[PDB]
Amino acid sequence: MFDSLSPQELAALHARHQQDYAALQGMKLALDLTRGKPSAEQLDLSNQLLSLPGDDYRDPEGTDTRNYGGQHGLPGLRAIFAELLGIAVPNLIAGNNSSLELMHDIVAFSMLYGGVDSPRPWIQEQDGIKFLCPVPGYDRHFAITETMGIEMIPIPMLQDGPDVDLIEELVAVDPAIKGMWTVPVFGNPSGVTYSWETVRRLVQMRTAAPDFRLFWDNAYAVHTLTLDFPRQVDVLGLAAKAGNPNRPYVFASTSKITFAGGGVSFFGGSLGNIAWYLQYAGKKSIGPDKVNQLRHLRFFGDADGVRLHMLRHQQILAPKFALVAEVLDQRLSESKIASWTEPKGGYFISLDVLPGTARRTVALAKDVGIAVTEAGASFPYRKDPDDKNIRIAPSFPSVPDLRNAVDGLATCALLAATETLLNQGLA
Amino acid sequence: MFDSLSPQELAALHARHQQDYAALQGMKLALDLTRGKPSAEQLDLSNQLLSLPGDDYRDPEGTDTRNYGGQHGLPGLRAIFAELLGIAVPNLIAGNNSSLELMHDIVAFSMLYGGVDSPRPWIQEQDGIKFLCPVPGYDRHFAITETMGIEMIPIPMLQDGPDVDLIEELVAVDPAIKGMWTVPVFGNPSGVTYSWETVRRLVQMRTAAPDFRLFWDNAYAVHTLTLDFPRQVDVLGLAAKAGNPNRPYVFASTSKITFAGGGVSFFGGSLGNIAWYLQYAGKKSIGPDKVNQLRHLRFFGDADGVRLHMLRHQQILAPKFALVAEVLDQRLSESKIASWTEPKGGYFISLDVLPGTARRTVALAKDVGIAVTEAGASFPYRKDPDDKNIRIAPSFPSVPDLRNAVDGLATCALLAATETLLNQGLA
Numbered sequence A, B: 001m002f003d004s005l006s007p008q009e010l011a012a013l014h015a016r017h018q019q020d021y022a023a024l025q026g027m028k029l030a031l032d033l034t035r036g037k038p039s040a041e042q043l044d045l046s047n048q049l050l051s052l053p054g055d056d057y058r059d060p061e062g063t064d065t066r067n068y069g070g071q072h073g074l075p076g077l078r079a080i081f082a083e084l085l086g087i088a089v090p091n092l093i094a095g096n097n098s099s100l101e102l103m104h105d106i107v108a109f110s111m112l113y114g115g116v117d118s119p120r121p122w123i124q125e126q127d128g129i130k131f132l133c134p135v136p137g138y139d140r141h142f143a144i145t146e147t148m149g150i151e152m153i154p155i156p157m158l159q160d161g162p163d164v165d166l167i168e169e170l171v172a173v174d175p176a177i178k179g180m181w182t183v184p185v186f187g188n189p190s191g192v193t194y195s196w197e198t199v200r201r202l203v204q205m206r207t208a209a210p211d212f213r214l215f216w217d218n219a220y221a222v223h224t225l226t227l228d229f230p231r232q233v234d235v236l237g238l239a240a241k242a243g244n245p246n247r248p249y250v251f252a253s254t255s256k257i258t259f260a261g262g263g264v265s266f267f268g269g270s271l272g273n274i275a276w277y278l279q280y281a282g283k284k285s286i287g288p289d290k291v292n293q294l295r296h297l298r299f300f301g302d303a304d305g306v307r308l309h310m311l312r313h314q315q316i317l318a319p320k321f322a323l324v325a326e327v328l329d330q331r332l333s334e335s336k337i338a339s340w341t342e343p344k345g346g347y348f349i350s351l352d353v354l355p356g357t358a359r360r361t362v363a364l365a366k367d368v369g370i371a372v373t374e375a376g377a378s379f380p381y382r383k384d385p386d387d388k389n390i391r392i393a394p395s396f397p398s399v400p401d402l403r404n405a406v407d408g409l410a411t412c413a414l415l416a417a418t419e420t421l422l423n424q425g426l427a
């Protein structure tokens, strides 16, 4: 940490940081690093969708997609994602424009009705319900459990998955633990992909709750930043082999493949779980939007069509991620106050600044017109116990804007560090 | 009832009915009068949607509809339905492809969280919850309350609304009554449209539950079978004037305007109710499909565009409804065993055959290859206490198929009547 600088040298460095920050403030910036959404250039890749499906409104089975019926979604589109996810067509359904809505409804159904093999609806559990939450994690997962009054237990992330030793120890003895949130490939925002061994342990471990569920939110399933695709671990297959076929609920989406908010969602599970979901989903809706599923089927053609499309996204995104890392390295590496992820896929870089300074860094950035994700955002209840983590979303801005924004962020992180050491430390 | 026929004459008539039925059976029919969905010819009216929105993916406000954001739906599309429904844009949101899903989620939110001004979540009411259900009514409404364990109280339908005297008497003294299902224009399947006076009474009546709600499912809001449109009663305005602004929840849909399952839904309410819904809907989804809302906005143009489109539907549908009535009249009127609605809009005709024979009539039809809606389908718990009601859906089949199907249905209804009088009555 500022290795071998004396207090006098640190005070001189702090003055340089203040001057960098004054200059930054003079530029009157209006930049934003918070939006985990595709750029306009990425969305342009899918503009053919805007004139699809055209005159032929029938799918390959002859179904008139313009009329009512069919809860499972179009088999032809499901076959594409069955190949990508390694889940058979009967074990996969296609929904409307939101995978979050599938996860949410599953939690709501679990509360009101219980899961397919629950002893009772979760709302009838007088001692409450808990979910395990690997951190840093996805704030919209946490929002679902928080709103339903489900207690969240944060779990440390390690190199090839969460802390599975700890998870096993907790779930074995606490029947209130009903679920775990995961993003098992390129996690938001850790960038961590769960190893085969991690997945095997999670589907085999003994749980005090007979109806424990892994919410396997494979949001980034094909979302590589390199020219290679990750191998999908067969979580449903491994779970069935362990005698826990109902344990995993698998989700996926085309929001960051085609149009964000105009895509198609997917839910995968055991046949029993598919039937359970559809029994209650059938009370909610006659069924999903088949015309939008058809447009996607026509656009993609097959699984290789999706893969090639992802490589086109990769060509736009990879330079943005490379840029963020390069700027952070060049500005922060020598000070040793920070560390950051170097993800091989997904939509985020996770930055840790000097512990005790993340909130301050965000406030400094806000005052020079750079929006940076709120401190604590990737934690349940927004509680980052070390006040160090900042999520960075590189996807949306132009390269020149991203460069300025991250360089500004670095200036703020450095100033927050020297300010705190000198003014609080050497008070 | 078979006026002035002697027992010998009735037995001879019964023999003629058996011969008509034998002949019907010989035709080896495969017909269906159960599907409340638009015909292919109606759906063809909206085929321009299949190539929309085209290159311009921006709405009039400049919003890129292909990207995330915006929970309320596109203001331009909401402005069209604001005019049609008589509800201001800020009081109306546009969703995805299902109005049922809006109603369902509202009931689920009410259970888990309570409504905006509830004393507690409805799930915490130890003595249970009840909804009033005007009958005959919409089976998918009843499916929502049944699945949530909400007791249903059936209420007789009268000429210009339900039995409001009875509703007022019950809601005043039972704090467990939290809601009422309605279809207030061209009801499914009564065809009844609630008068202004009926609506005024429903929004003014005292309720023991301070958070009582009218589920105002205006599914058939513009769905005329004549060249005239019904006047929309201002239920939200009247409710606000009575000091019960939060009482009505208004729903509408384009499923029977454009594509059934590929349309846009709407929810309208007080500003407080809109904010309440969106607070919990925001935990479920980042927001609705704006691209599909844009296609609809481009297609319709304005409220008069929707109206003209409905008159194009009316030209297809009205002859089908006229045909059903003519066949029933010609075959059944003299026997006086039956009565049926003559709706001025909506998607159904409600037929009452001889009480005690509806199940038998349906079974007879099934055995000659004519699918007719299950007896009891328009009642909570599928309980028609008079075993008389049969819902007829005229919209889907071709004219020649409809003619054959309804004429067959009449033959079955007549045979069920004579069979029952002779074999059970004169046993």
Ligand SMILES: Cc1ncc(COP(=O)(O)O)c(C=O)c1O
Pocket (backbone or CB within 6 Å): A036, A097, A098, A099, A100, A101, A138, A183, A188, A217, A219, A252, A253, A254, A255, A260, A261, A265, B286
């Ligand atoms: C982990 C994760 N799941 C789900 C989603 C949202 O996808 P959808 O648009 O299908 O809700 C996101 C980002 O949108 C995400 O990061």
Ligand SMILES: Cc1ncc(COP(=O)(O)O)c(C=O)c1O
Pocket (backbone or CB within 6 Å): A286, B036, B097, B098, B099, B100, B101, B138, B183, B188, B217, B219, B252, B253, B254, B255, B260, B261, B265
């Ligand atoms: C009364 C009523 N409400 C709602 C609906 C369904 O509309 P949506 O497709 O918007 O769920 C129907 C028929 O579909 C209906 O008859």
Ligand SMILES: [Cl-]
Pocket (backbone or CB within 6 Å): A134, A137, A138, A141, A181, A182, A183
């Ligand atoms: Cl997560």
Ligand SMILES: [Cl-]
Pocket (backbone or CB within 6 Å): B134, B137, B138, B141, B181, B182, B183
């Ligand atoms: Cl109803």
